[PDB]
């Protein structure tokens, strides 16, 4: 039946006219990766010491 | 030796600081100025390949002893030889390389050496050609034509030539601190 479908597809953040979902981490990915780089160096720059 | 097409230009540019061009230098008992400058040229060559540069240092080379004599031969061509890792154990004795820890001379198998081989005035980069010409010009200035101002300008210009040639060496074979050496390669393995 239409309402009691046992296969439940779950999206986190919906978008119009788009069959899937986009994660919540995607929206803050870039400042995530800019942390990554900026942090990476530091560890590398430590090892030179 | 033999005439070389670029070496005559080198001996000519030694005498460019003082006087006139000679021709072809191919006689032992000859123009004393040309043979004298040629000796200064080969001395500054043998000294300028002594300092160690990263195209001259042939890294993992293997020398082999003679099959009859069982005695590997040090040469005057072998400019300065050291071992691969650390605490080098090879030294010249008689004209033959010699262990100073194994206390022995006769070698069964080969030997692995970082060696410097003496090259010509050719087979060198143009940076180093200009630096041997300018330093040998400074020596030729200081020992025969003792004028002070040309000594001052050749000292300044030797310093500029060595500046360029250190730039050539730190641009030949990029040495990065943290991804190319032996200690802090393993510290940055994740």
Swiss-Prot record, chain A:
It is found in: Virion. Transmembrane segments: none annotated. It comes from the Viruses. Homododecamer. Interacts with major capsid protein. Interacts with the tail tube protein gp11. Interacts with the terminase large subunit. Interacts with the internal virion protein gp14. Belongs to the podoviridae portal protein family. Forms the portal vertex of the capsid. This portal plays critical roles in head assembly, genome packaging, neck/tail attachment, and genome ejection. The portal protein multimerizes as a single ring-shaped homododecamer arranged around a central channel. This is Portal protein. The lineage of its organism: Viruses, Duplodnaviria, Heunggongvirae, Uroviricota, Caudoviricetes. The chain holds residues 245 to 293 of 536 of the full protein.
Curated annotation (Swiss-Prot), chain B:
Keywords: Viral genome ejection through host cell envelope, Viral penetration into host cytoplasm, Viral short tail ejection system, Viral tail protein, Viral tail tube protein, Virion, Virus entry into host cell. GO terms for biological process: symbiont genome ejection through host cell envelope, short tail mechanism. Coiled coil: none annotated. One of its GO terms (cellular component) is virus tail, tube. InterPro entries: Tail_Gp11. It comes from the Viruses. Interacts with head-to-tail connector protein gp8, the tail component gp12, and the fiber protein gp17. This is Tail tubular protein gp11. It comes from Escherichia phage T7.
């Amino acid at each position: 039946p239409k309402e009691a479908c046992p296969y439940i597809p779950i999206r986190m953040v919906r978008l119009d006219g788009e069959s899937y979902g986009r994660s919540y981490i995607e929206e803050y990915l870039g400042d995530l990766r800019s942390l990554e780089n900026l942090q990476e160096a530091i560890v590398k720059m430590s090892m030179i010491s | 030796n033999v005439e070389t097409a670029a070496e005559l230009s080198a001996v000519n540019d030694i005498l460019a600081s003082i006087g006139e061009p000679p021709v072809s230098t191919l006689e032992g008992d000859a123009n004393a100025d040309a043979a004298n400058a040629r000796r200064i040229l080969n001395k500054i060559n043998r000294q300028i390949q002594s300092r160690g540069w990263t195209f001259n240092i042939e890294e993992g080379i293997t020398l082999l002893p003679d099959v009859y004599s069982n005695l590997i031969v040090y040469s005057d061509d072998y400019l300065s030889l050291m071992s691969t890792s650390g605490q080098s154990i090879y030294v010249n004795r008689g004209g033959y390389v010699y262990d100073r820890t194994s206390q022995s001379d006769r070698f069964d198998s080969g030997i692995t050496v970082n060696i410097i081989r003496l090259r010509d005035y050719d087979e060198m980069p143009e940076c180093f050609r200009y630096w041997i010409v300018t330093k040998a010009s400074r020596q030729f200035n200081n020992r025969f034509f003792g004028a002070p101002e040309v000594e001052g300008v050749l000292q300044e210009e030797e310093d500029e030539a060595r500046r360029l040639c250190m730039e050539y060496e730190m641009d030949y074979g990029g040495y990065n601190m943290l991804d190319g050496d032996a200690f802090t390669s393993g510290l940055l393995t994740r």
